């Protein structure tokens, strides 16, 4: 049971802020406050501020110049961390810790920020090949893994998941692609579409078969 727990949804390749802040007001001394941003599972040190001059280099090469706090923000009580170039490889829980020297080196703030990274898939491409009946659907560059649905545009219902063939790919750049091959018996005027849902973004994209 921490002082605060938070989830942060962040886009790949963007700047994100993980908030560790008090109700702002000029009431913190840099020469007094000790701040530690550290990964929660691996316990490695992402960044930190102490009043004495620090050797640095303690930060592994992973976060060295991509994670930063604001000194003016610290003086206002804003110890938030700023990551600069998010990758699906940063999807982990973080932990912020604040101690005071005026106080008994006591914890003024301790928060856990679970960081969920996501990227939006491309608009699906649907093909209409045939057999004695076959549909293929393609989307790329999304995160995390996608769910795919085939929608009957006539009554806005969803076709059964057993009728579709799903295959998930992990490309370079660490994103996800998907191919879904749907097989259904012939009927007059197939009006259907391929829906691809990014669960974390709560976003679905859909294209119909003309």
């Amino acid at each position, epitope marked *: 049971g*921490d002082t605060q727990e938070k989830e942060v949804r962040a886009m790949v390749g963007s700047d994100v802020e993980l908030s560790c802040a008090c109700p702002e007001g000029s009431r913190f001394d840099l020469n007094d406050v*000790y701040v*530690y941003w*550290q990964t*929660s599972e*691996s*316990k490695t*040190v992402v960044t*930190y501020h*102490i009043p*004495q001059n620090s*050797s640095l280099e*303690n930060v592994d090469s992973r976060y060295r110049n991509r994670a930063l706090m604001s000194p003016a923000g610290m003086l206002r009580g804003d110890f938030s961390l700023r990551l600069f170039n998010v990758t699906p490889q940063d999807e982990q829980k973080f*932990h912020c*810790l604040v*101690l005071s020297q005026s106080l*008994g*080196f*006591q*914890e003024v703030l*301790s928060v856990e920020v679970t960081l969920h990274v996501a990227a939006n898939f491309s608009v699906p491409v649907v093909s209409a090949p045939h057999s004695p009946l076959t549909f293929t659907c393609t989307s790329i560059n999304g995160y995390p893994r996608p769910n795919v649905y085939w929608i009957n545009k006539t009554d806005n219902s969803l076709l059964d998941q057993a009728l579709q063939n799903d295959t998930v790919f992990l490309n370079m750049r660490g994103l996800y692609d998907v191919v879904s091959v749907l097989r259904i018996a012939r009927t007059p005027s197939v009006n259907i579409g391929c829906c691809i849902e990014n669960v974390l973004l709560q976003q679905n994209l859909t294209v119909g078969s003309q």
Partner: antibody, heavy 121, light 108 residues
Framework: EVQLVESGGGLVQPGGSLRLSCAASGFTFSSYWMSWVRQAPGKGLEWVAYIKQDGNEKYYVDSVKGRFTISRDNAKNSLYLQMNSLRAEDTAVYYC??????????????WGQGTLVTVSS | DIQMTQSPSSLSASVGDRVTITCRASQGISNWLAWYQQKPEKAPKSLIYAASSLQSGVPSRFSGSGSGTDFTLTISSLQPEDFATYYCQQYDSYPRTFGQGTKVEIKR
């Protein structure tokens, strides 16, 4: 406020075993270094052992290596010192302590109250 | 792995006198030294941290000093309550190591 409560001390025969528990409260246990220091009656303060946040890196005293083991449970906020094959030289008061966070110690050591262990026939 | 040499190991000073204790480290420490005071059958009490900064609740007559290898704990005006054993501990690197301790008797 910061509180470190030792337990599990007392009297054990030579060659016996004893496990010391340290219940922590008042700070994020998982984020600090943990340590056991001891003091023999009338003798100075001698550090026993240190453990890092995750628990991979551990440091022991030559007098202790191969016989004691530090463990830590951040889920339950507790630190443990397991002693096996105790000798009379190990009779002392044992303090549980909270150390720094960084690789190069930064925070002053915060001391428990001590529990005392007597190894005697 | 770091060695602390504390001097003297014992001393006697009359009340109101000035007392000085030195602590030398095997290798360079950067103000990462604490000083503790211990009364018999009690746990050690933190007097000073970061070379010369007093902890909350320490009389101002206690003074810290030093940088690099050489450190000093100074009692300005000794008082009949100052009889104790004083230790220096480095927390520059783990394992943190202590000095042998300085016992202080009061001259009367």
């Amino acid at each position: 406020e910061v509180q470190l409560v030792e337990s599990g001390g007392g009297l054990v025969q030579p060659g016996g075993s004893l496990r010391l528990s340290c219940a922590a409260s008042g700070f994020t246990f998982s984020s600090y270094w943990m340590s056991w220091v001891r003091q023999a009656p009338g003798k100075g303060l001698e550090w026993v052992a240190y453990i890092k946040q995750d628990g991979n890196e551990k440091y022991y005293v030559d007098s202790v290596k191969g016989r004691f083991t530090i463990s830590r449970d951040n889920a339950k906020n507790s630190l443990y010192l397991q002693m096996n094959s105790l000798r009379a030289e190990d009779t002392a008061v044992y303090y549980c302590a909270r150390e720094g966070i960084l690789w190069f110690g930064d925070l002053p050591t915060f001391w428990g109250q001590g529990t005392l262990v007597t190894v005697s026939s | 792995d770091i060695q602390m040499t504390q001097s003297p190991s014992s001393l006697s000073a009359s009340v109101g006198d000035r007392v000085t204790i030195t602590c030398r480290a095997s290798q360079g420490i950067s103000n990462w030294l604490a000083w503790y005071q211990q009364k018999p059958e009690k746990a050690p009490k933190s007097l000073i941290y970061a070379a010369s900064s007093l902890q909350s609740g320490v009389p101002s007559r206690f003074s810290g000093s030093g940088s690099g290898t050489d450190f000093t704990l100074t009692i300005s005006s000794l008082q009949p309550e100052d009889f104790a054993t004083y230790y220096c501990q480095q927390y520059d690197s783990y394992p943190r190591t202590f000095g042998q301790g300085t016992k202080v008797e009061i001259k009367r």
